[PDB]
Write a protein that binds this ligand. Structure first.
Ligand SMILES: [Cl-]
Ligand SMILES: [Co+2]
Ligand SMILES: [Mn+2]
Ligand SMILES: [Zn+2]
Length: 654
């Protein structure tokens, strides 16, 4: 029993009751998964093991979620539970590598209490010494836990992570595992946020990636759909899998902004007002504008500390003694220097001591004990800076966000927003809100992002919008409403660079991504094709360094180039490598300073994706030196010694 789509084959063995995934390679196939069991329900702490094969029906010409392709419907039965499982896999004639899966269960004569449903599981075939993984979970740890994780198969430990999305986790419902021959992505096939896990788990000699959803009581005689997923078989690294997921999710209407509609000002070099921490003043910021302008900065963020309280989002009198005219004199000065002005905020936060909470507690999320619910940190808990959550279904909550947007743009002259320092959305138990379920607040969190952005756009179609779910992968359902993504308080060059590739994969190769400014890593910012940003008040050689790198970034402008993620595989090619095509020229960036993946010694550099019949001069554009005089495209291999990074362009020679 088998179905095929573009670049994928799926086979079902009725005896073992297993699925095997293959991808196409040349005229053949590569097995990507070991024969893997169908996902089942968890009852009384145990996955049900007694399912038997009833039927597998293959339809060769059918139309599904992804349009025309194929379908395989597997029916299974459990005598102990009375459950009949219907497991549907669909492939697409067009969508490369993608398998859509949907599961329903029918109960027999009696109710079945399921704590959890495992949707699909795939154990990687052909692993050797390590597997690399993309982990989209929002459960934290914040900041210092890498999104990209190496699963070492030679050590003592056993990697295991749930990758949650729930009332304390709002990130990306996707996981990928890959080796040299490629990988398997699994992601939630839902147009809207829901509770889901995408676990990554080391096995005896490999790893498995899976997806699962919360259980429910299945009433006797009832049929219930329990969850739907996309899987992507792919060559190469997580970029290819995540790109497959992006392509799949288009069919559910989760469509990321098209390149042609992204504003010019969302590609601009930016400085953010953290030169003095919370002790910035309007005049300190204005005092920097001449030098920032001369060095090539085109955008300024007024960062945290400008407001009285979250929710209210009124000007702090200490920062704005003359009120709105002070905000205007700031944004006017920014505009006069040829720059756009951005404003910091924390969407979803209605404050604690805010007038908003005092006058309108009914706008807020209410916990099960009848108390106002704090916004959660990843994995649970809160933070002293985080106020009470606005309920995204409360009209007054939404209006407070819209009113803020309209004031900041139309009264204060801001051109966009830096949303920051917020994660998931607590469950709401306020009876007056009449929620379908307590999870509805969590599910509807992104309504805040959508409505806010729609208001922003109505004022200015070129408005800038960014949201930082700091130290975690960004809330996936926020992404359609953004004009730029930050890697989100990366704590290492490894984090910022690898996340640039992940965000490019999910958002599009021209989607603006910044490598952020938590640490100074200008080469990482330029070479990944990211927007170089900064926040410090620099002097002396550090100032010169910033000016140098602004000049490079402003010359090559790789932030506006086409990111190319499918030529090199992170953790398998000799160097951590990034590629951007800008104005017809291939730019490459090789790094050794990322401790998570760095070669022994000085491997040869191979430039891929050049024309085989052409000859190229390889130029280090940072240092303006020729590192290789003349390479043919089909053998573009050279050796150069560098300590941390090498940024080169391949210049065609005639
Ligand atoms: Cl990372
Ligand atoms: Co942040
Ligand atoms: Mn291990
Ligand atoms: Zn509510």
């Amino acid at each position: 029993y088998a179905i095929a789509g573009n670049g994928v084959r799926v086979t079902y063995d009725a005896d073992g009751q297993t699925i095997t995934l293959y991808r196409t390679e040349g005229s053949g196939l590569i097995q990507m998964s070991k024969p893997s069991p169908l996902g089942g329900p968890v009852i009384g702490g145990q996955e049900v093991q007694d399912f038997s094969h009833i039927s597998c029906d293959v339809e060769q010409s059918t139309s599904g979620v992804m349009g025309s392709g194929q379908r395989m419907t597997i029916t299974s039965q459990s005598m102990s539970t009375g459950l009949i499982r219907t497991y549907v896999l669909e492939t697409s004639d067009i969508e490369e590598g993608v398998v859509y899966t949907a599961t329903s269960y029918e109960a027999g004569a009696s109710d079945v209490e399921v704590s959890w449903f495992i949707g699909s599981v795939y154990e990687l075939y052909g692993a050797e010494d390590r597997i690399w993984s993309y982990n989209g979970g929002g459960e934290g740890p914040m900041h210092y836990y890498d999104t990209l994780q190496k699963i070492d198969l030679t050590d003592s430990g056993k990697f295991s992570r749930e990758n949650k999305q729930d009332d304390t986790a709002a990130s990306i419902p996707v996981s990928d595992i890959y080796i040299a021959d490629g990988g398997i992505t699994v992601g939630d096939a839902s147009a809207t946020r829901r509770e889901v896990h995408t676990p990554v788990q080391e096995t005896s000699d490999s790893a498995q990636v899976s997806i699962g959803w919360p259980g429910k009581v299945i009433a006797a005689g009832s049929v219930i759909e329990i969850g739907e997923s996309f899987a992507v078989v792919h060559p190469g690294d997580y970029y290819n899998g995540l790109r497959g997921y992006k392509n799949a999710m288009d069919h559910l209407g989760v469509i990321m902004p098209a390149p042609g509609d992204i504003p010019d000002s969302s590609y601009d070099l930016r400085w953010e007002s953290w030169g003095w921490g919370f002790n910035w003043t309007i005049d300190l910021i204005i005092g920097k504008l001449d030098e920032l302008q001369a060095a090539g900065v085109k955008q300024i963020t007024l960062d945290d500390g400008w407001y009285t309280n979250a929710g209210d989002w009124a000007l702090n009198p200490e920062k704005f003694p003359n009120g709105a005219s002070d905000a205007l004199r700031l944004t006017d000065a920014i505009h006069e220097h040829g720059m756009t002005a951005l404003l910091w905020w924390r969407p979803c936060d209605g404050g604690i001591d805010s007038i908003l909470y005092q006058q309108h507690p009914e706008y807020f999320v209410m916990d099960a004990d009848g108390r106002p619910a704090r916004l959660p940190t990843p994995g649970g808990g809160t933070n002293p800076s985080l106020g009470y959550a606005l309920c995204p279904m409360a009209d007054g909550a939404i209006a407070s966000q819209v009113d803020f947007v309209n004031r900041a743009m139309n009264d204060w002259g801001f051109d966009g927003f830096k949303g920051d320092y917020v994660w998931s959305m607590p469950e709401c138990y306020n009876p007056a809100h009449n929620h379908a379920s307590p999870e509805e607040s969590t599910e509807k969190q992104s309504e805040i992002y959508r409505v806010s952005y729609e208001a922003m756009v109505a004022n200015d179609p070129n408005v800038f919008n960014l949201l930082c779910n700091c130290g975690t992968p960004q809330d996936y359902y926020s992404l359609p409403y953004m004009t730029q993504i930050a890697t989100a308080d990366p704590t290492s060059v490894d984090q910022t660079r690898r996340r640039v590739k992940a965000y490019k994969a999910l958002m599009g190769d021209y989607f603006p991504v910044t490598a952020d400014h938590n640490n100074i890593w200008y080469p990482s910012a330029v070479g990944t094709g990211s927007v170089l940003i900064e926040k410090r008040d620099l002097s002396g050689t550090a100032k010169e360094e910033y000016e140098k790198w602004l000049g490079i970034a402003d010359t090559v402008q790789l932030q506006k180039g086409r990111f190319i993620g499918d030529l090199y595989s992170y953790g398998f090619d000799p160097y951590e490598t990034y590629v951007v095509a800008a104005d017809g020229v291939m730019y490459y960036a090789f790094y050794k300073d990322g401790s998570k993946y760095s070669p022994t010694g000085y491997p040869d550099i191979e430039l891929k994706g050049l024309d085989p019949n052409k000859m190229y001069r390889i130029v280090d554009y940072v240092n303006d030196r020729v590192v290789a005089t003349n390479l043919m495209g089909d053998n573009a291999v050279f050796n150069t010694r560098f300590s941390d990074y090498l940024l080169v362009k391949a210049v065609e020679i005639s």
